Design a protein around this ligand. Structure first.
Ligand SMILES: CCCCCCCCCCCCOCCOCCOCCOCCOCCCCCOCCOCCO
Length: 145
């Protein structure tokens, strides 16, 4: 059950995270990962829905894995842009706010991060560009077009 979470600590340590509230209960806890291609509106839309879900459900730990189909730009670039605005993620009220968060910010590519992402996909039998979620170890998707 756990294996997806054990084999990918390096990746999962670097992605944007909204932790479960401290004041939330153990029974309200859930672990939701959204894996989506943030180069495209459909992937962005899925993350936006997940942000809205977390805003209203504060026992949820949400983390976000940018999973582009095209890797000409390092997958770590949008990841770092979003990571740099982690404290703002629950202040978003508008889809445009997420778009804006992804649009600018100069970051060196993280070569090790990119390799950890490729490894995560391979070992999870998913493809670059696929949009999916992991809920308490259950992988659901891909969610097609
Ligand atoms: C096409 C797909 C579109 C996707 C939309 C955007 C993606 C985000 C949406 C994903 C949401 C999926 O999950 C929804 C369910 O979660 C709702 C929030 O609730 C989380 C809580 O879940 C807890 C699960 O329950 C397990 C706890 C069991 C506890 C048992 O307690 C008994 C103890 O009692 C005796 C003790 O004295």
């Amino acid at each position: 059950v756990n294996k997806i979470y054990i084999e990918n600590h390096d990746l999962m340590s670097k992605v944007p995270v909204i932790e479960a509230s401290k004041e939330s209960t153990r029974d309200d806890w859930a672990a939701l990962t959204v894996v989506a291609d943030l180069d495209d509106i459909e992937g962005q839309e899925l993350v936006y829905y997940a942000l809205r879900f977390r805003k209203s459900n504060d026992g949820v730990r949400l983390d976000i894995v940018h999973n582009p189909k095209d890797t000409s730009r390092s997958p770590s670039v949008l990841a770092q842009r979003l990571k740099s605005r982690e404290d703002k993620l629950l202040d978003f009220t508008r889809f445009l706010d997420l778009e804006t968060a992804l649009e600018t910010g100069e970051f060196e590519p993280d070569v090790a991060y990119d390799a950890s992402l490729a490894n995560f996909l391979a070992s999870s039998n998913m493809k670059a560009g696929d949009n999916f979620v992991i809920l308490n170890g259950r992988v659901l998707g891909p969610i097609t077009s």
